[PDB]
Design an enzyme around this catalytic site. Structure first.
Site, PDB file in Angstrom:
ATOM      1  N   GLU A  96       4.813   5.099  11.626  1.00 53.63           N
ATOM      2  CA  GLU A  96       3.375   4.878  11.737  1.00 53.63           C
ATOM      3  C   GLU A  96       3.046   3.910  12.867  1.00 53.63           C
ATOM      4  O   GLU A  96       2.000   4.044  13.513  1.00 53.63           O
ATOM      5  CB  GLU A  96       2.817   4.355  10.413  1.00 53.63           C
ATOM      6  CG  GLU A  96       2.905   5.349   9.265  1.00 53.63           C
ATOM      7  CD  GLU A  96       2.130   4.897   8.039  1.00 53.63           C
ATOM      8  OE1 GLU A  96       2.049   5.671   7.059  1.00 53.63           O
ATOM      9  OE2 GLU A  96       1.597   3.768   8.058  1.00 53.63           O
TER      10      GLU A  96
ATOM     11  N   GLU B 256       0.823  -1.207   0.000  1.00 58.16           N
ATOM     12  CA  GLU B 256       0.000   0.000   0.000  1.00 58.16           C
ATOM     13  C   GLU B 256       0.859   1.260   0.000  1.00 58.16           C
ATOM     14  O   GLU B 256       0.531   2.247  -0.669  1.00 58.16           O
ATOM     15  CB  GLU B 256      -0.936  -0.007   1.209  1.00 58.16           C
ATOM     16  CG  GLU B 256      -1.818   1.235   1.332  1.00 58.16           C
ATOM     17  CD  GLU B 256      -2.766   1.160   2.512  1.00 58.16           C
ATOM     18  OE1 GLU B 256      -3.035   0.038   2.992  1.00 58.16           O
ATOM     19  OE2 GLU B 256      -3.231   2.225   2.965  1.00 58.16           O
TER      20      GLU B 256
END
Ligand SMILES: CCCCCCCCCCCCCCCCCC(=O)OC[C@H](COP(=O)([O-])OCC(O)COP(=O)([O-])OC[C@@H](COC(=O)CCCCCCCCCCCCCCCCC)OC(=O)CCCCCCCCCCCCCCCCC)OC(=O)CCCCCCCCCCCCCCCCC
Ligand SMILES: CCCCCC(=O)OC[C@H](COP(=O)([O-])OCCN)OC(=O)CCCCC
Lengths: 34, 105, 446, 425, 34, 55
Positions: free
Chosen positions: C137, C60
């Site tokens: 993240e 992604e």
């Protein structure tokens, strides 16, 4: 007792013009004690 | 409107003076038994009525302790007895009955 | 004027075609000048092994960073210059990439989706860039108590199985995932029969099918050399995980039982029950007067900052329950009232409150499918899960069947006397012991 | 064939008393209704700050035709919704439900807006919600920046906060709420908008229940731009900062030039995790800054004024460098360095973004409701795109010129040790 | 659920430059519900 | 000499105060308005400061 000066518990209200003289500031100072 | 509903008031004025809470400087709504509905109505009273209600009750518990009453001049007159609580109380009940009608839908 | 029943017939049926190579192309036409098109894929962490977990999430990050025909930032430039928007997401079972754009830009948008899936650059220098990004993240996610406690719920509830894995994978896998791992993931999972080209907006289905046969013909054929991912069932385990951390201001709890799955008719009746319990947080207006007893009590006595019920579906399994956030001295009271409502619906649900839960679901369903993006999502997802689009007229029929007897039978089947999975995080000293939680899943009076 | 039916056209009406009605029949399964009122926080003065906030929290309180209990239970039984959104200019009472239950929610909507009782005790129980509701909002550093930005920009009106000042919590009186609804919830100030409802119903409703006179005519309490700066030293890890100048009031052609200028500079990301290759401000900052940051053009347009500029987020030490790099990039445009393909690309984003913002019922109803109040008319999207296409490149440049030379307003919060004042730019 | 928009319990932290895009404001709105 | 001979730290730094001008407005619920209006004047010790004291 702690102090804050600058002129050269609900506290209390001011309403008239005679008790209001002396309140306007004139440099701040902060003091502390035992 | 008539003379028959006027002695009706005369016997209600009679029962009022016999009940004798006016002898302690009290009003009818000062004597209501506090349940959940009444406690809510008292909660809703404006500051002036709440504070007045507090003092009248305090004045009466003081008198009751001494087994005394006020002078006749200071008794609560049946004509001047403000039902100050029933407007608030009637709305409390009205709200509760609404909940109860919804609860059975 | 038109009635609610009459309005449900007035929705255009999703037209469905299938290419020669396996890809499925589905569209719902409207009169909109905008639209959204995207590719939905049967891929996610549940298909990944412990040794390559987090790969699809790595993809992604790389999907929009370059391609063979449009290397580098050339792909960003093209969508931004035509005012379009490009997005993606990855769950434990599904992966999607979609574009929002003008209807006239549909042919270019389909071309870009095709170029993203098939021809991906994956330059070794971009990977090393996206490696440090993912690790940051992960540090960010550690501060979302909500996202943590649900990863904990999956970890304990499906322990020993692929579903226990997080989507992002562990920090150790991020640091060693190689380019060979990623291309292996793509070649295996990104095959035409396991993908859907969904679109929604102002567009004729003929046009969408023409573009699919043009830009998606190069996909792998129906056969794949005998190496198909066959999802095994995933054992649910009644269990509990507590991460004690008194330095955090509020405790997060999530508790759930095993749910049926995607294509089980019981989900409808379960969603009605969840709507009766509903949801809440401190900014709602109703407070004391809310219908849900859990909500009303929680607002009156201030037992939580928020709670929400949920029914998370997976293939042949799921997580059904609730989650909440509260002060450290309110956890016990919240769990008492929560379980009390589960038990009360199992044994003594009334017709009136079930009509409310039915109407709440009706409203939630129509208003969610409002706009080109959520329709295109429901198209793509519904074909990977149900193998078809379920019209709103059918959903309404599956709801009207539900009455009080249905929720009592359905709820008892999944809630009553079942081992729950529990996950706690924060100041959870007052979190009840698992045996006490387990005894709250039945009533001695019944 | 699988095609949609004949799309009906929006119907629109202006009653002589000033009230506006707009309806659309999309034959949808759900219906949405909105009563948009010119009653935002600009219409508070310094003796009743926060009244429109508490009013925004009091939609479920008791009315003359519905107890607080009935509103909550009536709407929830149908699964419907009742919301209240507020701008510095408008309040918007929105209602949502299935089209068979429109009768019920319309009655609730009218009682909320036409017959609130504001009972002394209900109001009293609600005041703590101001503290909670404000506390939630200010979890976003953006929220306090924008609030401070408007307080520094204006002398009155638009300087007012959407959220009640701390000193007013507990002191907003039932009388102030009564006076506020009397002065501001007038026919001349209102618009009744409906999706999935027929126009004769809305008109009937409007003539019967929304004919309220008096109060305050559309006051000319003009917002007076001033300029200034507000600096909030706190312990956030990043510095948020906004720098603006007076721009253009909404509806005018100059405002369209500012909207286009926004998308030349960079309003927001269009691709997930992208470098924003076509964002002029982002690339300008990124050249001389290799640490995490964000930068975006800021555009806010009001009935009688507007603010335009940019918004920055950066490490506390990189504050000035990000600010100055952003400012110089705008200076470049004011100096006339602007290609035509960049404008056609910005007009593409703005045109595409506008149509996207009206895909759904909620976004469509909001635009129609705010069009009706700001303009007294409805302007279909094909005409909006025409007005966008009419923006020339020189208009965009002059818009950037007005920013560089105009008296500025700045708000910043964080560790401001390296965050310049205005006169240091 | 209450809303505040402006782009056109410990919440969560932001550290990198990719998760930071989309945060800069672009006019405030305050909304309330049931 | 015995206990107050401490060196190092910071020499009498020339971190000069930079006058700027501006205004800060605190809306509250006091009954009266307090307000102060000033301009840069003179550093202490200089003769200009005595003129300000007399003024
Ligand atoms: C001998 C005398 C027997 C007295 C029995 C009292 C029955 C009773 O109170 O009914 C409540 C009880 C309600 O329990 P529930 O339906 O599960 O709902 C739980 C509540 O929401 C509330 O649930 P909860 O989570 O708040 O509390 C759980 C509670 C649930 O159990 C109880 O409340 C039992 C009450 C104590 C009985 C003491 C037995 C002696 O368990 C206990 O705490 C009791 C532990 C006793 C430890 C004593 C160690 C020595 O109903 C019954 O169990 C009646 C069936 C008894 C059969 C009688 C045989 C004929
Ligand atoms: C005449 C019958 C009396 C019944 C007593 C009773 O059941 O008490 C509760 C527990 C089991 O219920 P639970 O703790 O699972 O809670 C269930 C929650 N739904 O049982 C025991 O362990 C208590 C031992 C008593 C010894 C004196």
């Amino acid at each position: 007792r702690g102090v804050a000066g600058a002129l050269r518990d609900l506290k209390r209200s001011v309403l008239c013009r005679e008790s209001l003289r002396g309140q306007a500031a004139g440099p701040l100072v902060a003091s502390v004690s035992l | 409107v008539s003379a028959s509903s006027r002695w009706l008031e005369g016997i209600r004025k009679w029962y009022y003076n016999a009940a004798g809470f006016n002898k302690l400087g009290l009003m009818r709504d000062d004597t209501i038994h506090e349940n959940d509905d009444v406690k809510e109505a008292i909660r809703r009273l404006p500051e002036n009525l709440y504070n007045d209600r507090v003092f009248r009750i305090k004045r009466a518990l003081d008198l009751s302790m001494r087994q005394q009453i006020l002078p006749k001049e200071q008794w609560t007159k049946y004509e001047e007895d403000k039902s100050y609580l029933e407007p608030y109380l009637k709305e409390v009940i009205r709200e509760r009955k609404e909940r109860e009608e919804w609860a059975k839908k | 004027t038109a009635t609610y029943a009459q309005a449900l017939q007035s929705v255009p049926e999703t037209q469905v075609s299938q290419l020669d190579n396996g890809l499925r192309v589905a569209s719902e036409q409207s009169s909109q000048p905008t639209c959204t098109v995207g590719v939905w894929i049967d891929a996610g962490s549940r298909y990944e092994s412990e040794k390559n977990n987090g790969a699809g999430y790595f993809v992604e990050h790389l999907a929009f960073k370059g391609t063979k025909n449009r290397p580098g930032n050339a792909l960003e430039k093209e969508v931004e210059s035509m005012g379009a928007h490009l997005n993606a997401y990855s769950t434990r079972e599904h992966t999607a990439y979609y574009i929002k754009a003008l209807s006239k830009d549909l042919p270019k948008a389909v071309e870009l989706l095709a170029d993203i899936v098939q021809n991906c650059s994956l330059e070794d220098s971009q990977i090393e860039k996206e490696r440090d990004v993912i690790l940051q993240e992960l540090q960010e996610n550690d501060t979302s108590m909500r996202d943590v406690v649900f990863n904990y719920l999956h970890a304990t509830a499906f322990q020993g199985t692929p579903l226990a894995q997080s989507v992002e994978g562990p920090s150790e896998n991020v640091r060693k995932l190689s380019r060979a791992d990623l291309t292996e993931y793509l070649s295996r999972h990104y095959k035409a029969p396991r993908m859907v080209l969904a679109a929604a907006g102002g567009l004729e289905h003929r046009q969408l099918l023409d573009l699919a046969q043009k830009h998606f013909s190069g996909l792998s054929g129906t056969y794949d050399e005998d190496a198909v991912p066959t999802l095994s069932p995933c054992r649910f385990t009644g269990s509990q995980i507590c991460h004690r951390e008194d330095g955090l201001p509020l405790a997060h709890v999530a508790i759930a039982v095993e749910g049926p799955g995607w294509a089980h008719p019981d989900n409808v009746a379960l969603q009605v029950a969840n709507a009766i319990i509903g949801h809440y947080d401190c900014t709602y207006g109703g407070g004391a007067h809310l219908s849900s007893p859990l909500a009303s009590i929680a607002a009156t006595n201030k037992l939580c900052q928020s709670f929400q019920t949920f029914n998370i579906c997976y293939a042949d399994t799921g997580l059904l329950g609730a989650h909440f956030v509260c002060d450290h001295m309110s956890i016990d009271d919240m769990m008492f009232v929560l379980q009390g409502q589960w038990m009360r619906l199992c044994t003594s649900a009334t017709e009136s409150e079930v009509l409310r839960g039915k109407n709440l679901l009706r409203n939630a369903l129509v208003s969610h499918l409002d706009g080109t993006t959520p329709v295109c999502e429901d198209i793509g997802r519904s074909l990977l899960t149900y193998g078809r689009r379920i019209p709103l007229a059918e959903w309404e029929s599956r709801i009207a069947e539900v009455d009080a007897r249905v929720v009592r039978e359905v709820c008892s089947k999944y809630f009553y006397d079942q081992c729950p999975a529990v996950a706690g995080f924060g100041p959870i000293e007052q979190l009840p012991d698992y045996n006490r939680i387990r005894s709250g899943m039945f009533w001695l009076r019944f | 064939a699988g095609v949609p039916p004949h799309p009906q056209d929006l119907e629109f009406t202006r009653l002589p008393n000033g009230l506006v009605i707009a309806s659309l029949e999309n034959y949808a399964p759900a219906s949405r209704i909105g009563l948009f009122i010119k009653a935002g926080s600009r219409y508070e003065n310094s003796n009743n700050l926060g009244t429109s906030h508490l009013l925004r929290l009091a939609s479920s309180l008791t009315t003359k035709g519905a107890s607080s209990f009935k509103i909550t239970r009536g709407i929830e039984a149908v699964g419907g919704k009742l919301s209240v959104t507020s701008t510095r200019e408008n309040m918007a009472y929105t209602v949502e439900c299935l089209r068979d239950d429109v009768d019920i929610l319309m009655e609730f909507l009218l009682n909320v807006t036409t017959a609130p009782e504001f009972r002394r005790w209900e109001v009293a129980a609600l005041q703590p919600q101001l503290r909670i509701d404000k506390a939630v909002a200010l979890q976003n550093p953006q929220a306090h920046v924008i609030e401070n930005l408007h307080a520094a920009a204006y002398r009155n009106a638009l300087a007012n906060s959407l959220y009640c000042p701390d000193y007013r919590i507990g002191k907003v009186t039932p009388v102030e709420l009564h006076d506020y609804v009397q002065n501001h919830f007038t026919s001349a100030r209102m618009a009744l908008i409906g999706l999935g409802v027929s126009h004769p119903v809305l008109k009937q409703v409007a003539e019967q229940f929304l004919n309220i006179r008096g109060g305050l005519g559309l006051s000319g309490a003009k917002a007076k731009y001033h300029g200034g700066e507000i600096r909030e030293q706190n312990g956030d890890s990043l510095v948020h900062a906004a720098l603006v100048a007076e721009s253009a009031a909404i509806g005018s052609a100059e405002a369209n030039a500012f909207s286009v200028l926004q998308h030349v500079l960079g309003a927001g990301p269009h691709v997930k995790r992208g470098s924003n290759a076509t964002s002029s401000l982002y690339q300008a900052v990124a050249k001389g800054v290799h640490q995490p940051f964000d930068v975006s053009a800021f555009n806010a347009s009001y009935s009688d004024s507007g603010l335009f500029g940019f918004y920055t987020i950066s490490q506390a030490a990189s504050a000035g460098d990000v600010i100055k790099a952003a400012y110089n990039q705008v200076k470049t445009i004011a100096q006339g360095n602007l290609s035509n393909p960049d404008v056609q690309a910005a007009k593409n984003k703005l045109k595409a973004g506008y149509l996207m913002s009206v895909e759904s019922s909620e976004g469509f109803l909001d635009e129609v409701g705010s069009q009706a109040l700001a303009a007294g008319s409805y302007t279909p999207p094909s005409t909006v795109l025409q007005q966008i296409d009419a923006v020339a490149d020189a208009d965009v440049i002059n818009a950037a010129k007005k920013f560089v030379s105009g008296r500025k307003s700045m708000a910043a919060s964080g560790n401001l040790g390296h965050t310049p004042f205005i006169d240091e730019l």
